[PDB]
Symmetry: C2
Subunit: 238 residues, 2 copies
């Protein structure tokens, strides 16, 4: 039985506060905690505390922590809007989806780790989003493995970019030193590296590394357009 | 003062076992623990236990946990071999480096999280590896931002691919259910999804998702060659 078909029990009223619990109340409460504190803090006991319920009342709806994270992932994917069908402009569709995905990860940074370690999430919101993405390239004459490879290249670009954004943001929360400040403090050492002459490529790219001309929103898009051009090239050959 | 120039104190002999400690003994012991148990288990106290030393003796060489992970990352990067110069064949060089990187991550799966959340690691092994990579494309006439964008596309492909490999491996360690077994158990649900007709793209790609014709080593390479072709195309335009 997949946790996606696992029959949800009737809403049950407790004797603590006397409110009624359900699976999706528990998953939303778990997302609210993870959004500030990370997936690790969103323990069944913690989420039970957030809802004023006994922890055992939660297990009745969500049997394990691992099941809770799976539910949480599919639940936040459902905030994404995209249209029902991608339409005739595949670059446009993939761009809309990439924008929406980046914004999703930024709202929920624990995705930049929860999103596919191992098994794929086959809940309804993830499946719908994947039909839209796969659907953009499914109109062309590709073998399955060509299709997955190209969507893989697209997914990896989007995910790698936003994982790095999230990593800096998360670092700043932990250390109180953000990207700007880090780059300022590393200035003297970077100059030592440059003076040594040992790292001519490092020296070449430092200015743009330390203080890029384009911000992340611009860079996300420029690299995306490059990625899309080359998919367009793979589609011309075929 | 960068932890990369931070002057290492003389080797100090303890009164527990009576052995001499040094920074690189501590970092190697920390890698040995992380390699089996993850970065989180490789606490200063745990690594101190691995070495039979008092935890305070470790802080004398490595002041924080965060400094220890940075050291650990650069230390494992030094297992990579690559040649001193990339040579005239840029696709070859980038392929060698990608192979070596994938193998590194597989030997040290905690890299698939430790490797650039936030700030870049500017220790000697990481800088050397980056000169080799950046150096392959530095021979051409690109602006800095074109160069970083293309190396970004390359890095994201390699890192996304191996992060997913590591995620399954890590899942299998935790759950004792590996990719094959997962796919077998999800068979019935996948058939329900297919029967519904709601997910025609899911249905199209299932066979290749559940039991791919090509293994990861083959797929890594085929996608890499595609990525390299398109970099070759960006270089033709310029």
């Amino acid at each position: 039985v997949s946790i996606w078909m696992h029959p949800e029990p009737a809403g049950r009223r407790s004797a603590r506060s006397h409110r009624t619990l359900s699976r999706d109340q528990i998953v939303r409460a778990a997302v609210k905690v993870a959004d500030t504190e990370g997936v690790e803090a969103a323990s069944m006991r913690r989420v039970a505390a957030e809802l004023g319920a006994g922890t055992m009342s939660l297990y009745y709806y969500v049997p394990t922590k691992e099941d809770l994270v799976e539910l949480m992932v599919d639940e936040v994917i459902g905030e994404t809007r995209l249209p029902d069908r991608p339409g005739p402009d595949w670059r446009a569709a993939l761009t809309l989806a990439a924008n929406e995905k980046r914004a999703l990860w930024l709202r929920h940074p624990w995705l930049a780790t929860a999103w596919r370690n191992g098994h794929p999430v086959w809940g309804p919101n993830s499946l719908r989003q994947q039909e839209f993405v796969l659907g953009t390239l499914g109109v062309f004459d590709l073998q399955v493995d060509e299709l997955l490879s190209l969507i893989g290249l697209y997914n990896g670009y989007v995910e790698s970019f936003v994982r790095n954004e999230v990593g800096w943001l998360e670092e700043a929360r932990r250390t109180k030193v953000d990207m700007r400040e880090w780059m300022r403090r590393s200035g003297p050492y970077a100059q030592q590296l440059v003076d040594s002459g040992e790292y001519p490529m490092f020296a070449r790219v430092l200015a743009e590394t330390v203080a890029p001309h384009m911000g992340p929103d611009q860079r996300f898009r420029s690299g995306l357009e490059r990625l899309l051009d080359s998919i367009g090239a793979s589609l011309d050959r075929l």
